[PDB]
């Protein structure tokens, strides 16, 4: 987005200044070009002069203003995609009750009881369980008062900026390219789930190419479904965006909310409103208060779904900004936030599409970082999606999600204290698809030290999962 104002205040919001990823026994074996992101300005690994405070907000390079004709085109694309979405999902989009928004419904996980509560609560030393009854699905007076302000369209909030404690390529770490999480107030998440939670549940339950969304998928089971679909198209592309969430422009976010979340599709009128509160935001980082126009905060309850919807509309808009006769059947795609696979039997020129995405504020490049840029003839076995390749398994004849061994090494090389055993079981479920030899190599630093699931047990499990 466009930073329109920066100011200092006495109230100090203590941002992330720690590192909860300890190196494991595996670090010394694999020596990964990956490490924890820098969480303190006094981190020796960063380059001299690197000031994360500057770097971490450099993503806010502006808010692209769109022309009348381009906005009218975007509106048509948003309405055409919305028509497709709602035809699949239905229009039972009435608000969830407070209980259902807290506890979840089929296709929507319950709210987290002990994650960050956001502002102003973070100042007051209050936890989420002190504001909401996650067992009974009720709210206290504080939240109830805010919900009434939201009903009245009178609610205002600040985003709380957290630095993301995660493993990153050591190059990004050296450059201070630490990611931020914008933690919204828990009552804003709550009301958003009230306004659009049934829609989100339906999105999850209907994930697939038809709606262009993989949010809610299970890669172990669904890679077969997605792979067989994309295998039958002549051209497949995997596209990278630069700072996709920060570069969603005000015009595009407002129009998308207006066309997707209409009352004529069953939504309460405040569905559009609460989503629109995401466009112009205020972010709290220590004594800094930074006001931004445009861009999506990461901590909306529906950030992934909203990013996915925008991705779908961006592709239709860009193709239509360059070709005549483009329709939702001219191509197929599936997206997860900024992640995207597009396919088509037409020789679409993604190189030529670069300026049309730029008119939206977005910069697309091939995911292969090729020097020629986009090309034709790539297949589903060439692309990466959710960090996973699409590989045929020969015992079953089914597609399986295969992660890069370098990435698995990095994941296994760090862990927070007292979770190594738990993490190994988790990562084992990702690594089984790399085959027995690599699976063995990946886990050999932990032999005699922790329980390692047998390759056989996880393969037999996966087989029943993908067919049974």
């Amino acid at each position: 987005g466009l930073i329109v104002d920066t100011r200092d205040v006495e109230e100090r919001v203590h941002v992330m200044r720690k590192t909860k990823l300890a190196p494991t026994v595996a670090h010394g074996v694999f020596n990964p070009e990956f490490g924890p992101a820098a969480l303190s300005n006094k981190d020796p690994r960063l380059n001299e002069g690197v000031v994360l405070d500057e770097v971490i907000f450099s993503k806010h390079k502006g808010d692209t203003k769109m022309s009348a004709e381009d906005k009218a085109l975007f509106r048509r694309c948003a309405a055409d995609y919305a028509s497709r979405l709602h035809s699949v999902l239905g229009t039972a989009n009435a608000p969830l009750s407070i209980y259902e928004a807290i506890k979840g419904v089929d296709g929507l996980d319950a709210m987290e009881p002990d994650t960050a509560p956001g502002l102003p609560w973070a100042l007051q030393g209050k936890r989420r369980g002190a504001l909401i009854d996650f067992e009974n699905g009720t709210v206290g007076p504080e939240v109830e008062a805010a919900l009434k302000l939201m009903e009245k369209r009178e609610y205002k909030f600040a985003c709380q900026t957290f630095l993301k404690d995660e493993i990153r390529p050591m190059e990004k770490v050296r450059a201070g390219k630490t990611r931020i999480v914008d933690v919204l107030p828990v009552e804003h998440i709550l009301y958003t789930r009230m306004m659009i939670g049934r829609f989100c549940a339906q999105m999850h339950s209907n994930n697939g190419p038809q709606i262009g969304s993989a949010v809610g998928c299970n890669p172990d089971v669904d890679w077969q479904r997605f792979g067989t679909h994309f295998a039958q198209y002549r051209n497949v592309w995997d596209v990278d965006y630069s700072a996709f969430d920060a570069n969603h422009c005000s015009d595009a976010m407002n129009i998308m909310f207006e066309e997707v979340f209409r009352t004529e599709f069953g939504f309460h009128p405040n569905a559009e409103w609460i989503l629109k509160t995401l466009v112009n935001t205020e972010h709290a980082y220590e004594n800094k208060r930074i006001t931004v126009e445009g861009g999506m905060p990461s901590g909306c309850s529906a950030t992934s779904i909203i990013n996915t919807i925008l991705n779908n509309i961006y592709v239709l808009y860009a193709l239509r900004r360059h070709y005549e006769g483009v329709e939702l059947d001219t191509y197929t795609m599936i997206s997860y936030g900024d992640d995207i696979v597009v396919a088509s039997d037409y020789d679409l020129d993604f190189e030529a599409l670069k300026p049309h995405f730029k008119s939206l504020g977005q910069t697309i490049t091939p995911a292969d970082k090729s020097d020629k840029g986009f090309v034709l003839g790539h297949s589903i076995t060439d692309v990466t999606f959710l960090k996973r390749h699409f590989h045929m398994d020969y015992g079953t004849g089914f597609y399986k999600p295969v992660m890069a061994s370098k990435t698995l090494e990095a994941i296994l090389s760090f862990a927070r204290r007292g979770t190594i055993q738990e993490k190994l079981i988790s990562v084992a479920g990702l690594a089984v698809h790399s085959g027995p030899d690599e699976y063995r190599r990946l886990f050999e630093p932990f032999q005699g030290l922790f329980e390692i699931p047998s390759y056989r047990s996880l393969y037999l499990r996966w087989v029943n999962a993908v067919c049974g």
Partner: peptide, 6 residues
């Protein structure tokens, strides 16, 4: 053939 240019 493929789609059209405007």
């Amino acid at each position: 053939g493929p789609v059209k240019k405007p």
